[PDB]
Write a protein that binds this ligand. Structure first.
Ligand SMILES: OC[C@H]1O[C@@H](O[C@H]2[C@H](O)[C@@H](O)[C@H](O[C@H]3[C@H](O)[C@@H](O)[C@H](O[C@H]4[C@H](O)[C@@H](O)[C@H](O)O[C@@H]4CO)O[C@@H]3CO)O[C@@H]2CO)[C@H](O)[C@@H](O)[C@@H]1O
Ligand SMILES: OC[C@H]1O[C@@H](O[C@H]2[C@H](O)[C@@H](O)[C@H](O[C@H]3[C@H](O)[C@@H](O)[C@H](O[C@H]4[C@H](O)[C@@H](O)[C@H](O)O[C@@H]4CO)O[C@@H]3CO)O[C@@H]2CO)[C@H](O)[C@@H](O)[C@@H]1O
Ligand SMILES: [Zn+2]
Length: 472
């Protein structure tokens, strides 16, 4: 059957199914309703930065159309909606004055979701640092971010936490560190060679450390001030793509494990065990910041659940570990990514070149977290694939590749859960075609088609696949 035996009965009792967006990618009204600019507004308005010089000024205009979009998700039988609050829509300068019109928007959204029986899962941060904070403080390079983020988080807990019971602090701090401070291809565009300055060998580590410390500080504030009354939870969202040893050799097996440690262990070892992975300590040395005992104790156990964004997988080939002049976080791993084994590609690619369709990667990742980290509560916070630009409306709607993607990936997730993985929920990226960062509107991840000329929504075949799979 097109559901392939999947339904709510195939997953644990009370398992949560939702869709996910982020503020800058869907809201629009980027310079309206009192919102201050984010680093992404400045970046996207710079000629050459985004495909077609596009930006999120209008995006999907969810700001005006949110009731349509909530009605749609309810009609598709989802239980939950993961979205983010734009920091600069609440605090246009990142600190100080509150934008009441911004607060009203999120109140209206949260209330409508609850009216329609959809549980809000709310991210505080999704790449969209207030521009004012980047300029005044130097953003995530500055340890003062812990204080600034905590004050913002405190405001959100106070204002929305009587209703919102499932929070996430950050979305994929690894991607911020990698693209913003190693490769320098995302804001603030820092890297060793970059015009804005930087150092690809040091700054990604500083940035990651500050995300961990900021997460821990915000969670300590939630736990000491709000949790008794509100009785909600706070986690973090981490990207994790699967790495499989290219062969059963010692060097290849070591390579795959080293890659896992630099990718996900970078954050999970601090969050679960209170230290960075040993291999990062051994290889990165003085360039890896050291947690004080007090900080490690604040960071350890500071996530109520681990959000995982899971998309893809690759093979890893190793070599002899060697002494080398530091150049970048990326080069520090001393591995080679490989996308074919025994002459056959690991999987076909979706529209994004990095996204190889490999359903067994989902099992790989979930099983690995279960076995390595004491089976913490995991939520799959994003999973999906993209269509290319320039298709007809009907071609977008007939998304048979995406239907196959979800059926296969969800079957692999079911396999891991049936083997005992503590997975509490799953969220499809995305509800809607949206602004896909550097790809702008050239990459379509939605289960619902958005016509970017008229802004009309049209559910794709994959949306009706979910509706059928999720009927109560
Ligand atoms: O309906 C509005 C909209 O829907 C869009 O999507 C369609 C799909 O294109 C179409 O293939 C799909 O058909 C499903 C059907 O809904 C299921 O009920 C059926 O499931 C069977 C299964 O085949 C058996 O093996 C199993 O044992 O029993 C079940 C249930 O009895 O499977 C077929 C797929 O072959 O339905 C979607 C939603 O209607 C259309 O693309 C669009 O044109 C429509 O406007
Ligand atoms: O994208 C959909 C949606 O989900 C989330 O998107 C994240 C993904 O979770 C994350 O895995 C993805 O990471 C990509 C990254 O964008 C690429 O730039 C990077 O490219 C590599 C390249 O493949 C290598 O050949 C080269 O050596 O290095 C570069 C890195 O400089 O590859 C990774 C995957 O391995 O990033 C997505 C966001 O950009 C987000 O939560 C959501 O907002 C997205 O819309
Ligand atoms: Zn509008």
């Amino acid at each position: 059957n097109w559901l392939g035996g999947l339904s709510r009965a195939a997953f644990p009792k009370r398992f949560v199914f939702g869709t996910v967006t982020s503020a800058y990618q869907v809201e629009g009204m980027a310079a309206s309703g009192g919102r201050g600019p984010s680093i992404w507004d400045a970046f996207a308005h710079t000629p050459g930065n985004v495909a077609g010089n596009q930006n999120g000024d209008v995006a999907t205009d969810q700001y005006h159309r949110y009731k349509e979009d909530v009605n749609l998700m309810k009609s598709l039988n989802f239980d939950a909606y993961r979205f983010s609050i734009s920091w600069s829509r609440i605090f246009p300068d990142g600190e100080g004055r509150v934008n009441q019109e911004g607060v009203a928007y999120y109140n209206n959204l949260i209330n409508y979701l609850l009216q329609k029986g959809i549980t809000p899962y709310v991210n505080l941060y999704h790449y969209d640092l207030p521009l004012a904070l980047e300029k005044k403080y130097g953003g995530w390079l500055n340890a003062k971010m812990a204080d600034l983020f905590t004050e913002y988080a405190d405001f959100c807990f106070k204002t929305f936490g009587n209703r919102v019971k499932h929070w996430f602090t950050f979305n994929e701090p690894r991607i911020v560190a990698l693209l913003g401070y190693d490769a320098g291809t995302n804001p603030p565009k820092r890297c060793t060679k970059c015009a804005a300055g930087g150092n690809s060998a040091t700054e990604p580590y500083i940035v990651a450390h500050n995300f961990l410390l900021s997460h821990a500080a915000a969670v300590a504030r939630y736990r000491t001030k709000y949790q008794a009354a509100q009785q909600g939870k706070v986690g973090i969202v981490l990207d994790f793509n699967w790495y499989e040893a290219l062969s059963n050799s010692t060097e290849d097996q070591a390579a795959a494990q080293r890659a896992r440690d630099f990718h996900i262990g970078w954050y999970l070892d601090p969050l679960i065990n209170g230290h960075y992975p040993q291999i990062m300590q051994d290889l990165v040395k003085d360039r890896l910041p050291k947690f004080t005992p007090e900080q490690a104790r604040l960071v350890k156990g500071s996530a109520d659940y681990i959000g995982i964004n899971q998309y893809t997988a690759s093979y890893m080939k190793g070599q002899q570990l060697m002494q080398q002049t530091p150049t970048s976080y990326s080069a520090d791993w001393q591995v080679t990514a490989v996308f074919a084994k025994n002459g056959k590609p690991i999987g076909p690619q979706a529209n994004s070149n990095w996204l190889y369709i490999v359903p067994w990667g989902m099992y790989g990742c979930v099983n690995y977290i279960k076995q390595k980290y004491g089976n913490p509560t995991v939520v799959i916070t994003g999973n999906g694939m993209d269509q290319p630009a320039n298709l007809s409306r009907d071609q977008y709607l007939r998304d048979t590749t995406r239907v196959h993607f979800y059926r296969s990936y969800l079957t692999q997730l079911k396999k891991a859960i049936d083997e005992g993985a503590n997975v509490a929920g799953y969220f499809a990226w995305s509800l809607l075609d949206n602004f896909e960062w550097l790809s702008g509107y050239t990459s379509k991840f939605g289960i619902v088609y958005v016509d970017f000329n008229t802004l009309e929504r049209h559910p794709k075949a994959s949306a009706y696949w979910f509706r059928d799979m999720l009927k109560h």
